[PDB]
Amino acid sequence: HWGYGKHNGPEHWHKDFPIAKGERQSPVDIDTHTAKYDPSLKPLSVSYDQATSLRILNNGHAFNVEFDDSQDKAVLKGGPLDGTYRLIQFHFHWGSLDGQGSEHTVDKKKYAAELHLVHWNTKYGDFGKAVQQPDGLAVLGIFLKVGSAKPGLQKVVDVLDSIKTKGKSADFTNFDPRGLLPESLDYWTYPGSLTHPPLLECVTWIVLKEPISVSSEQVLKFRKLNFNGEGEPEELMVDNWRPAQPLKNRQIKASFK
């Protein structure tokens, strides 16, 4: 039902998912001049050396690069987090043109795209249990701008032709997500939600300050994907982002001065 089309997009989601108007919805605008440096926050610990990617899937709203999360391999720890969060998948949000695509914004600036690396809290045993808890997920968000190519993205780019339509997947082993990080891991953090239905309020957001650069050719391949299934009317997979939601009673904390 829900999507990013002309009649089922973010402004409609609240009908079926009333949590869309909840108290800790994502994404949000990050006001750089009211996010406060928090000296109690720690450097992120991104431990991806043993990551095992398995598969890439077009799910009709993005594509997910899926990992083996059946044991502690690729984990996120530290930062604002207590305990250990296992990497399950990453995906992107992007626009029809370079001036929109990100979910989070920075002083109202929209980036061309945003990468989400999704991790679940091992204290809850499985992902399905984790999403029912306020500290169940940690999502590392990384902005993309268009300029130079990102070498470590090309292997993703080049498989997209094989998963054009919803429900298609392809083997995708030995991909190293470290090639998608910027140089600095300085970040903002706040409590929020998943950004598409069911919009569960289970996420500690960790949004990196420094964007990565990808090329116009790389982004153009993203924009050739389809929301639709094989043989159905073609709807390009573009503008798969939810706009910023009210901050309400939340504070955005910065890891950096």
Other C-beta atoms lying within 10 Å of the C-beta of residue 52:
16
The verdict on 242 binding Zn ion (CB under 5 A) reads no
Q: Are 187 and 210 in contact (CB under 8 A)?
A: no
Task: Return the range that interacts with Zn ion (CB under 5 A); candidates 42-50, 116-124, 126-134, 238-246.
Answer: 116-124
Spatial distance between the Cα atoms of 111 and 102, rounded to a whole number of angstroms: 5
254: Cα within 13 Å, side-chain hemisphere: 13
61 assigned to active site: yes
Which one of the listed residues 1, 14, 61, 119 is annotated catalytic? 61
Question: Which lies closer to Zn ion via its Cβ, residue 24 or residue 116?
Answer: 116
Question: Which lies closer to Zn ion via its Cβ, residue 193 or residue 226?
Answer: 193
Shortest CB 116 distance to Zn ion, Å: 4
Shortest CB 93 distance to Zn ion, Å: 6
Q: Are 200 and 189 in contact (CB under 8 A)?
A: no
Chain centroid offset of residue 96 CA: 17
Phi, psi (5° rounding) for residue 15?
-65, -50
Task: Return the range that interacts with Zn ion (CB under 5 A); candidates 8-16, 69-77, 79-87, 108-116.
Answer: 108-116
Shortest CB 23 distance to Zn ion, Å: 20
Residue from 110, 116, 166, 242 binding Zn ion (CB under 5 A): 116
Which of 62, 105, 108, 95 shows the shortest CA–CA distance to 211? 105
Question: Which lies closer to Zn ion via its Cβ, residue 227 or residue 256?
Answer: 227
Discontinuities in the chain (C→N > 2.5 Å), after residue: none
Other C-beta atoms lying within 10 Å of the C-beta of residue 97:
13
Q: Are 211 and 144 in contact (CB under 8 A)?
A: yes
Task: Return the range that interacts with Zn ion (CB under 5 A); candidates 109-117, 120-128, 212-220, 240-248.
Answer: 109-117
Shortest CB 157 distance to Zn ion, Å: 18
Shortest CB 36 distance to Zn ion, Å: 26
Question: Which lies closer to Zn ion via its Cβ, residue 79 or residue 192?
Answer: 192
DSSP secondary structure code for residue 110 in this structure: P
Question: Which lies closer to Zn ion via its Cβ, residue 34 or residue 193?
Answer: 193
Question: How many binding residues for Zn ion (CB under 5 A)?
Answer: 1
Shortest CB 205 distance to Zn ion, Å: 11
Task: Return the range that interacts with Zn ion (CB under 5 A); candidates 25-33, 79-87, 110-118, 154-162.
Answer: 110-118
Q: Which residues of 66-93 are buried (b: 16+ CB within 10 A; e: fewer)?
A: bbbbeeebbbbbebbbeebbbbbbbbbb
Question: Which lies closer to Zn ion via its Cβ, residue 80 or residue 101?
Answer: 101
Residues marked active site are found at 61
Binding site for Zn ion (CB under 5 A): 116
